[PDB]
Amino acid sequence: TDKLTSLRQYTTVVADTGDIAAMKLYQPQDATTNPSLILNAAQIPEYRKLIDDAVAWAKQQSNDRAQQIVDATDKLAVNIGLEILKLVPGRISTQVDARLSYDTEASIAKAKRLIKLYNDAGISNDRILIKLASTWQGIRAAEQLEKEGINCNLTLLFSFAQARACAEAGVFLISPYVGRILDWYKANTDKKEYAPAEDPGVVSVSEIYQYYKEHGYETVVMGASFRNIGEILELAGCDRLTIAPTLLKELAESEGAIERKLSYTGEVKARPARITESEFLWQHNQDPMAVDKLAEGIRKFAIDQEKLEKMIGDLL
Amino acid sequence: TDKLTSLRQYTTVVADTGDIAAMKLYQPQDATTNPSLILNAAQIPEYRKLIDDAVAWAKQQSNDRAQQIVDATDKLAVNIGLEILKLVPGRISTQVDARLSYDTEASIAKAKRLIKLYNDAGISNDRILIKLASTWQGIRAAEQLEKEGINCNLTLLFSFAQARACAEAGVFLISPYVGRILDWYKANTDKKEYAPAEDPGVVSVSEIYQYYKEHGYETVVMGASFRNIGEILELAGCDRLTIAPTLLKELAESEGAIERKLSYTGEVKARPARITESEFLWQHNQDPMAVDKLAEGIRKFAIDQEKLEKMIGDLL
Ligand SMILES: [Cl-]
Ligand SMILES: [Cl-]
Ligand SMILES: [Cl-]
Numbered sequence: 176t177d178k179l180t181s182l183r184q185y186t187t188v189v190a191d192t193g194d195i196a197a198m199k200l201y202q203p204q205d206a207t208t209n210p211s212l213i214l215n216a217a218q219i220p221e222y223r224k225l226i227d228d229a230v231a232w233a234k235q236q237s238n239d240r241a242q243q244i245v246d247a248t249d250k251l252a253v254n255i256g257l258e259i260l261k262l263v264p265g266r267i268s269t270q271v272d273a274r275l276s277y278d279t280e281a282s283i284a285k286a287k288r289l290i291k292l293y294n295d296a297g298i299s300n301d302r303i304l305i306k307l308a309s310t311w312q313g314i315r316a317a318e319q320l321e322k323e324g325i326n327c328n329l330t331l332l333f334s335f336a337q338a339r340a341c342a343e344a345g346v347f348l349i350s351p352y353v354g355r356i357l358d359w360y361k362a363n364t365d366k367k368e369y370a371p372a373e374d375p376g377v378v379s380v381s382e383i384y385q386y387y388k389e390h391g392y393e394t395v396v397m398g399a400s401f402r403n404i405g406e407i408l409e410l411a412g413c414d415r416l417t418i419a420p421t422l423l424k425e426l427a428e429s430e431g432a433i434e435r436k437l438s439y440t441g442e443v444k445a446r447p448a449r450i451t452e453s454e455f456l457w458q459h460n461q462d463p464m465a466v467d468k469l470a471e472g473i474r475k476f477a478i479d480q481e482k483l484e485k486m487i488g489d490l491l
Numbered sequence: 492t493d494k495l496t497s498l499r500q501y502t503t504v505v506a507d508t509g510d511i512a513a514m515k516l517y518q519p520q521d522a523t524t525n526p527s528l529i530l531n532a533a534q535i536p537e538y539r540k541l542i543d544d545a546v547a548w549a550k551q552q553s554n555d556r557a558q559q560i561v562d563a564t565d566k567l568a569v570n571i572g573l574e575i576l577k578l579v580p581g582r583i584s585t586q587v588d589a590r591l592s593y594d595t596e597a598s599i600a601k602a603k604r605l606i607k608l609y610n611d612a613g614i615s616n617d618r619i620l621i622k623l624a625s626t627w628q629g630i631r632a633a634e635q636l637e638k639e640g641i642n643c644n645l646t647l648l649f650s651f652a653q654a655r656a657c658a659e660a661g662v663f664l665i666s667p668y669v670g671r672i673l674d675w676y677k678a679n680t681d682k683k684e685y686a687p688a689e690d691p692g693v694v695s696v697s698e699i700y701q702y703y704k705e706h707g708y709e710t711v712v713m714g715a716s717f718r719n720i721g722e723i724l725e726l727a728g729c730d731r732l733t734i735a736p737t738l739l740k741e742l743a744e745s746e747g748a749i750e751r752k753l754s755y756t757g758e759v760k761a762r763p764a765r766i767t768e769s770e771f772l773w774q775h776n777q778d779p780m781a782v783d784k785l786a787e788g789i790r791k792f793a794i795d796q797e798k799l800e801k802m803i804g805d806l807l
């Protein structure tokens with residue numbers, strides 16, 4: 176047996192890519208995309224049809240250029256989601272424009288708009304996760320969306336404060352990063368070598384997992400962003416893990432059974448009072464890694480969004 | 492003539508220390524303190540009377556230990572402020588517990604408490620600045636305090652978003668940092684040498700000064716936190732500058748007249764709509780330096796507060 180097969184006994188495998196080739200190859204349950212993966216998957220010549228469809232559709236919905244750019248970029252992300260749903264039985268994650276990350280109202284609106292486009296294609300809400308950055312504003316947006324039947328993937332989750340706040344908001348799923356946590360520690364300490372169990376991204380997810388299970392929270396824990404297979408194996412037992420094709424390949428090519436690493440066998444414990452905004456802000460900003468990486472991840476995703484819109488604008 | 496004397500033609504000189512010796516020596520207009528300067532000034536044997544007075548007074552106001560700790564640490568800061576006001580004609584800046592930095596209500600309450608203690612000593616509000624970190628919550632706290640006749644010093648000002656928000660809130664004074672901005676650039680780029688005019692902290696304050704004057708804002712601009720006299724000289728013309736004794740000494744010992752560097756000679760311009768919380772959050776987090784340093788400065792001031800309270804708790 177190979178390690179990818181063995182992992183699937185303990186963990187729901189999810190493919191982190193916009194490339195349908197990977198869906199066929201690894202047959203994941205869910206898939207995740209983001210603005211940069213959409214931007215990358217756009218250059219694939221076989222996807223040119225999806226870009227043209229998106230641009231054409233946008234011109235049929237309105238006559239204003241600015242609106243056509245937005246409509247086309249949204250429809251493109253959706254169009255790619257639709258191709259992926261042909262090949263996976265579970266969820267597709269589609270990311271909202273990260274420029275809205277500190278705007279609750281705008282994020283709710285944008286989530287609803289992407290859902291409308293999916294619904295217009297005949298896809299139900301139970302096949303979709305809307306990905307938002309887990310700022311306070313994003314978490315509050317997600318809380319509201321869930322009440323309206325729109326399930327959310329709360330991403331760029333770095334601090335325990337973010338983890339706690341997401342759970343208390345009843346979000347469908349969280350995407351705690353692993354690899355970008357490792358990146359920080361390598362950039363800000365002189366320890367650049369870590370055993371898998373002491374990888375700080377692995378430690379973060381394990382602690383979050385424990386807290387979620389021990390309090391009986393339903394939010395799906397999905398580790399994301401990996402630098403190596405060691406990190407992935409150390410989180411075997413995590414509800415889901417979203418993994419890039421390069422690392423799915425490495426697992427598939429690695430022989431041997433693996434053991435479950437993440438479990439909670441105790442009973443559910445009473446929950447505390449909800450963390451307030453002020454408490455969340457204090458506790459998030461206690462974590463210098465999380466401070467840096469949440470803001471940084473948002474900046475980079477917004478740049479990817481802008482580049483996507485540039486590409487679409489040239490075709491109109 | 493010396494450079495300290497020459498600077499005073501263009502800029503109001505302020506002493507950044509809790510040490511009364513410096514007030515006598517340099518005869519500044521205002522003084523600034525903070526938890527660490529209070530903690531430092533506590534070890535000075537000649538201040539032991541101020542610590543004992545604070546502890547004694549606290550035991551007379553109440554019988555609860557926890558409240559005595561808070562009362563004593565507040566009274567100590569106030570007691571030091573009072574000794575300084577004997578030797579300066581202008582303002583004393585006293586910093587609120589930085590653990591409150593993301594809590595508007597608590598910060599307002601704390602500001603009012605420190606003002607009460609000063610008022611109880613016979614000091615008017617026009618001699619005092621309450622120093623709060625310029626988070627959104629701190630700015631909103633300051634807006635309200637100003638309306639109630641309590642003047643504020645908005646500190647740890649790093650991003651343009653913080654500057655704009657403070658001006659629009661009508662705060663009495665801002666303390667844009669200079670040296671800590673330089674710190675970040677040195678640590679996060681491979682340029683560790685900067686000409687005074689290209690020092691990123693100097694550039695920051697100069698841009699803020701321009702924006703404030705050009706829009707006729709009354710908020711006092713007071714550069715703070717300096718690594719060298721080059722930075723200070725490059726901001727000659729800034730409304731005020733708060734300077735550590737070490738650097739005041741260097742200026743006093745430096746011979747020669749200096750030129751004014753910071754001026755605005757144009758007419759006042761129309762102001763934009765107020766920045767919203769969401770816009771502020773977006774724009775502040777676009778500035779990786781400011782993201783890091785605002786949170787870091789708050790963490791360190793809170794640690795200094797805790798150490799001060801430890802020291803006070805041992806004496807009760
Ligand atoms: Cl968002
Ligand atoms: Cl929208
Ligand atoms: Cl950001």
Ligand SMILES: [Cl-]
Pocket residue numbers: 310469470776
């Ligand atoms: Cl952030």
